[PDB]
Design a protein around this ligand. Structure first.
Ligand SMILES: OCc1cc(F)cc2c1OCOC2
Ligand SMILES: [Cl-]
Ligand code: NA
Lengths: 304, 301
């Protein structure tokens, strides 16, 4: 029994983290095969950051300008190129600890594990969700850029996030491993803001199901509803629309617990309209939306 | 900025997880140098759950009754001994992935990371605290016994918890790596129940300081309190007594924020009285007690 926000074991990714220094800037890199991946903004000074021309900034650097440290050992940079907002540093040695991996781009609402790093050294791991406004509510300090996010399925590490910046509201923005930003953000010191966020409806439902599985049932009721009716409620409370795909995805949990998805939506409708009236759900006084349906299944089953 | 329940990176512990089989029972073991540590209840049969005599059960076993599997490799067991409630299986191969490690018995209120595992392979990593009633609020399914809790300080893994059992209220009980249980629990399936749980007051105060560090002051007030009047109030909300040690421990966070410990205590008293009135603190609508003062300093600016 029990339910906890849970991250994937980080071992396979720890073995890929290196330190990358350009001039006076140190941040983290990801070492896979013979390439180290890191944010392209490592090549900027503070004045550069204001309005950088990355291709011209890069033309002036030589391979020996990039100091790459794997633990206590220097790696030798033999090439450098850019793909979108990530810098690719070809090194002379393939990482002997390279796991089986893919680069994948995730959808808002999907979760992943973040391995926060500083000076190439892993410091902590935590679970994040890609918000509907394409930010993440991470925990990062100066030096964390280049930390990565990932999922694992059957050993295969799926890398989905590289950290690039913090927004004025304290939430975080980054790219996939092909250098494409999540959200309408740019790697420069210009005025940027997170848009208004919404609540990930399908994930709240999944967490309500996790709650029922764990014996927390007080919010169940006799009523049911329809998609169109519920989605009118979701819009009112700044919840994402619930689609038919979402009902299908929740399928398993629906039959395992005898609450149909639209049965649960009537519980959530009531929770949105009336509050929790002093009670909690899985120990929370808020409705939690950073557990996917798969997250709930994996934890409420044994997957390793 | 930001503030998250953060676990330690798990790789150093992943390289130590193995599967231990005895009879029909499979659970997890911790492989350090040439010793595999696991719960001694792995040797119980269905008859032995209520009143096992572990000495009598163990003297009947030989080394080859214990199967130990590391990844796909069988390890050869070449000795066995029982220390309190853990079995220590001597194996013929030292673990080449053994980190710098130590065994530390922790106090209530201390936090640590749990590497949940099933059949010797890690499933997920999360953060727990030792509750005042010596249970932890974990996430453990059948087959997770032998999963371990740990902190990592620099490059040294301090192992502090081994999972043994789930109590009827859904909370969890285990041992230190010397096999001594936390709390009054025993590895028997007789009715036992944890004491009434309480909130870890020094940890909530630390988390309130985290919120100030990250730029939030809405909950402070113009008052202060004596330490004894604070405790008289906080017991009425089932909060643990705050001691002068706790006040000392919070010194550094007080210096960083400029808020004296007993003034932060006055803010806590008002929050217990008022609730949050529709606001949140570091994203939570309840007061959070599983971050220690040490955790806050290590995560925050
Ligand atoms: O994991 C629970 C468990 C299994 C078992 F085979 C024997 C005992 C157990 O709990 C403590 O009491 C002895
Ligand atoms: Cl301690
Ligand atoms: Na219903």
């Amino acid at each position: 029994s029990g339910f906890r926000k849970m991250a994937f074991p980080s071992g396979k990714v720890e073995g890929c983290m290196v330190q990358v220094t350009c001039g006076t800037t140190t941040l983290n890199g990801l070492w896979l095969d013979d390439v180290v991946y890191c944010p392209r903004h490592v090549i900027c000074t503070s004045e550069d950051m204001l309005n950088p021309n990355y291709e011209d900034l890069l033309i002036r650097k030589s391979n020996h300008n990039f100091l790459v440290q794997a633990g206590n050992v220097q790696l030798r940079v033999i090439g450098h190129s850019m793909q979108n907002c990530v810098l690719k540093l070809k090194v002379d040695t393939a990482n002997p600890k390279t796991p089986k991996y893919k680069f994948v781009r995730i959808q808002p609402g999907q979760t992943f594990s973040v391995l926060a790093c500083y000076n190439g050294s892993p410091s902590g791991v935590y679970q994040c969700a890609m918000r509907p406004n394409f930010t993440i509510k991470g925990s990062f300090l100066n030096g964390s850029c280049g930390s990565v996010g990932f999922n694992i399925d059957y050993d295969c590490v799926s890398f989905c996030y590289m950290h690039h910046m913090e927004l004025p509201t304290g939430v975080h923005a980054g790219t996939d491993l092909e250098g494409n930003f999540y959200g309408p953000f740019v790697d420069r010191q210009t005025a940027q803001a997170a848009g208004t966020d919404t609540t990930i409806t399908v994930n709240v439902l999944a967490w309500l199901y996790a709650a029922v599985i764990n014996g927390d049932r007080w919010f169940l009721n006799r009523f049911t509803t329809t998609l169109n009716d519920f989605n009118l409620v979701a819009m009112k409370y700044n919840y994402e629309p619930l689609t038919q795909d979402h009902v299908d995805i929740l399928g398993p949990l629906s039959a395992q617990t005898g609450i149909a998805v639209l049965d649960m939506c009537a519980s959530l409708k009531e929770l949105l309209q009336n509050g929790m009236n002093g009670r909690t759900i899985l120990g929370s006084a808020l409705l939690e939306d950073e557990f996917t349906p798969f997250d709930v299944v994996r934890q409420c089953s044994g997957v390793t």
